[PDB]
């Protein structure tokens, strides 16, 4: 009924700013909690996020930023029917959390490859720094981290055992939170 934990958001810095907060006691955020987020221009438009229940008493939201730059600033208004519960601000550019890489498969030398989680025009594509974890599925003790940053999201290695692999990336120059590791592919 009362947000105990002030809301916190990270931005994928292309389309989605995911939020979360925590009230006191069980709340179906979707039934009642109303989040209202608007950017800071002159003919600003109103967007309403339908929240969800992350835990018993906590809530989660997902703002949709069609195109966001370094000078964007959102007014986050959490409603309760007609009782304002919290009012604040959000700058998507300081709290960036990139997308997860994907399309990860495997092809002497051994070839790993994945997709850039963003198109080239997106700013994160220019200082992305991939990190690929190769751990053996047969040998959990065997694990290795591979730093990548090439514009082509791929890796080559040529070290009997069976290994797995999963990649996560993050835009270096923007001081982002380590993205979620890509799905874990498997091979020998």
């Amino acid at each position, epitope marked *: 009924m009362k947000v105990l934990q002030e809301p916190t958001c990270v931005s994928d810095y292309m389309s989605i700013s995911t939020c979360e907060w925590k009230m006191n006691g069980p709340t179906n955020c979707s039934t009642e909690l109303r989040l209202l987020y608007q950017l*800071v*221009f*002159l*003919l600003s*438009e109103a967007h309403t996020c339908i929240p969800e229940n992350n835990g018993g008493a906590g809530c989660v939201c997902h703002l949709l930023m*069609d*195109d966001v*730059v370094s*000078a964007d600033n959102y007014t986050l208004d959490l409603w309760a029917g007609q009782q304002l519960l919290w009012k604040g601000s959000f700058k998507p550019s300081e709290h960036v959390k990139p997308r997860a890489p994907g399309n990860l498969t495997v092809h002497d030398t051994l070839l790993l490859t994945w997709s850039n989680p963003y198109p080239p025009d997106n700013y994160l594509y220019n200082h992305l720094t991939y990190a690929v974890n190769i751990w053996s599925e047969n040998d959990p003790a065997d694990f290795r981290i591979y730093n990548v940053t090439y514009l082509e999201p791929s890796l080559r290695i040529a070290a009997g055992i069976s290994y797995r692999a999963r990649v996560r990336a993050w835009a270096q120059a923007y001081n982002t939170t380590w993205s979620e590791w890509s799905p874990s592919t498997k091979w020998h």
Partner: nanobody
Amino acid sequence: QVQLVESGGGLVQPGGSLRLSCAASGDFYCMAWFRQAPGKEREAVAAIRSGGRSTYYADSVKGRFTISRDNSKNTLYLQMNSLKAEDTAVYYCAVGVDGNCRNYWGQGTLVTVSS
């Protein structure tokens, strides 16, 4: 300091068209136009993002007026068609780097939709 000099205003027969032009010495995050009429305070007619890709118009002018800027040298445009008589006003082109494009204004140019 950035000067703003509008142009392209003048007398227009109603239902016609009118393309406004206001040059800025440099480029800006926020760029918007402001129409101000006799006894009527300057209202936000049209705005444009930093990296653009998002136009913002007033309900009175949506689908009617279009705001834009050329390449190389930057020049705020307020293209207007089907100009209604109640649009008669000195429109001002204003620029900004945060929130409302209220960093500069540089006066404006009068639009008079004739009878």
